Design a protein around this ligand. Sequence first.
Ligand SMILES: O=P(O)(O)OC[C@H]1O[C@H](OP(=O)(O)OP(=O)(O)O)[C@H](O)[C@@H]1O
Ligand SMILES: O=P(O)(O)OC[C@H]1O[C@H](OP(=O)(O)OP(=O)(O)O)[C@H](O)[C@@H]1O
Ligand SMILES: [Mn+2]
Ligand SMILES: [Mn+2]
Ligand SMILES: [Mn+2]
Ligand SMILES: [Mn+2]
Lengths: 344, 343
Amino acid sequence: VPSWPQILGRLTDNRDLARGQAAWAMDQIMTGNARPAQIAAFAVAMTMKAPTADEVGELAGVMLSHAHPLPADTVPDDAVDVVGTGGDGVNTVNLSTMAAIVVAAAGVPVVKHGNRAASSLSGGADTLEALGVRIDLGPDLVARSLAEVGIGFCFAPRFHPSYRHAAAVRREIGVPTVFNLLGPLTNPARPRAGLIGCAFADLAEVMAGVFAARRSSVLVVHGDDGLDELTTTTTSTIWRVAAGSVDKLTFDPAGFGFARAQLDQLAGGDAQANAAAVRAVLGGARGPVRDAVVLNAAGAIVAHAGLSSEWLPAWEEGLRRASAAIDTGAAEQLLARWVRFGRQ
Amino acid sequence: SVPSWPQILGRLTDNRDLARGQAAWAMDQIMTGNARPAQIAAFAVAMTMKAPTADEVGELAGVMLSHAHPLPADTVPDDAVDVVGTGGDGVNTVNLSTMAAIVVAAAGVPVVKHGNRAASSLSGGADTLEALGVRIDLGPDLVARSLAEVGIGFCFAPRFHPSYRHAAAVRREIGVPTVFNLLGPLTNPARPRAGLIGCAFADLAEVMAGVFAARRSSVLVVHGDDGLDELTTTTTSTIWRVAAGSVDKLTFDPAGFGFARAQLDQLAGGDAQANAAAVRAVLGGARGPVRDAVVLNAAGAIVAHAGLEWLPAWEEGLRRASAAIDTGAAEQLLARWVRFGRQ
Ligand SMILES: O=P(O)(O)OC[C@H]1O[C@H](OP(=O)(O)OP(=O)(O)O)[C@H](O)[C@@H]1O
Ligand SMILES: O=P(O)(O)OC[C@H]1O[C@H](OP(=O)(O)OP(=O)(O)O)[C@H](O)[C@@H]1O
Ligand SMILES: [Mn+2]
Ligand SMILES: [Mn+2]
Ligand SMILES: [Mn+2]
Ligand SMILES: [Mn+2]
């Protein structure tokens, strides 16, 4: 029978867990039956042991079993996510949130998982909130947002109430652990595609492994400068997940005509500063930030195409649609229509 | 930089040895109620899986000792010895350290024993002593009087380390052994300079030895090659011998002193009442495998005391230990120990 001394002892002995043990642990944590000390011990122990795809898969599986689902037949089968682990410690503009809006305006259904900042000044949820977008909608209203606007936002705490004990321990110990991976892996709407950012180069492959087990079409991205984003300051490492297999690639924006940028050119601020930065990009303003948004939006579109079916043509078409979605004003319009939807 | 949990924990998760003072900072935060249980647990686990260094463990123990209740000045003889282990060998044996401690004290060697109740066994040293009528929870002044009048004193770790309670609680909750399990033997409040120190975790005995070496203590850190945190009689033992601030590892065979091979079955104990009866049995002069184990461990502590020639030291240790029992001195010392607590 499973117990904490058994599982913790196994992890501290640097052993992989038996099937079901990670699942048992997470379920204890989600049902409020685990002491903070046990939660912390488990989180740390698994991280230093080096999590397997199976183990992390079991953790996310439990979370999704307890998560508030969206109503049946309300999420298109080709819906995409654009979200990162966060915690790169750079405080950039909200590239995922900006990319998600552009991708939606390009005609790709987007059901975005998100959350407030943890280590940054303003996270996606914070910036969206500052734009007038509603980040408090339940399953039904998110479904309506998807249908009517083309984009929905699932605020993780709203859909994962049982995760509050784990989230508290994350806050207390501060150090990143395997828990930092679970957000991007537990979109309640369960889209089968997405552009997933990972700040931790050593854990990106594991994330990709989990998505692969689900037969998802995902690009797990880690900027070689440390961003949990497709960066423009240098190359990016992409773990391409397609047909249940992971393929490690290095991506260079220069190969698609993009100039190198400095990190301070992508720097952000508070929610109001970042909101203004969203408006600028969608407004047609050229520069480093636009390039970053277009590239990331294109990545999400590449991930989308990996569902129904190569690499260079997909990116070239992705870059086209993302740029066009901005230049026609569609992305700017979608945001406006999104804000109005909430007030209605 | 600014000391913080994200910093230190982050360093441990990255599998880097800590900088000087960081381990001390962490332990001090824990020892002052300024650490959340989650932070306590994260640190304990992280410090364990990285693999703690002698420097780091030394800082943890140091902080504990800098907070602990000390014994009054000039109450602890300079040649006082300790007999204690980390516990957690998994084998429910009789209480060899406590029994040896009584024998050693009866032989004339001052013993100030550190100790605690059971954590995973059916009965710890403190539990068995309590069942014998010995007062275990005495404060500094009375432990000093005990040491003077009786020739032995017992420091109950919860009594002398009240600020360790938060760490102790967390250890209880997570169950798994951590670096904290090493601290007990390393934090005797009376700070005896010699001792026989048991370590259940073979891979960490050298670390414990390094800590004692840093204090230039005369210590034998023992790990039975059958898993016991004791000098065993079922097979050979690993001894990390600490003398002159230097550690030297070696294999020890009690057969070289005439001791027959025993089996773990013969050293098995039970609850406090059973183990207490086992103590009375040995001190009564009963021959058998239990007596051999006690005399062996008692001798080791005497050898450690002497460290303040290897073979002759053991021969005199085994001789003095056997005599302390057979003369009835060890039995009498226990009885006198009980009367002290009752007056
Ligand atoms: O504070 P951090 O730990 O650094 O994380 C920053 C944000 O990144 C994650 O979401 P998201 O991918 O949507 O962020 P983004 O839109 O800004 O790119 C996370 O939910 C945070 O909101
Ligand atoms: O339950 P455990 O975790 O296994 O530990 C058993 C005992 O060992 C330690 O003391 P001590 O060295 O005095 O033990 P002993 O007298 O029985 O030999 C510890 O303080 C416990 O009292
Ligand atoms: Mn992001
Ligand atoms: Mn980011
Ligand atoms: Mn012992
Ligand atoms: Mn023992």
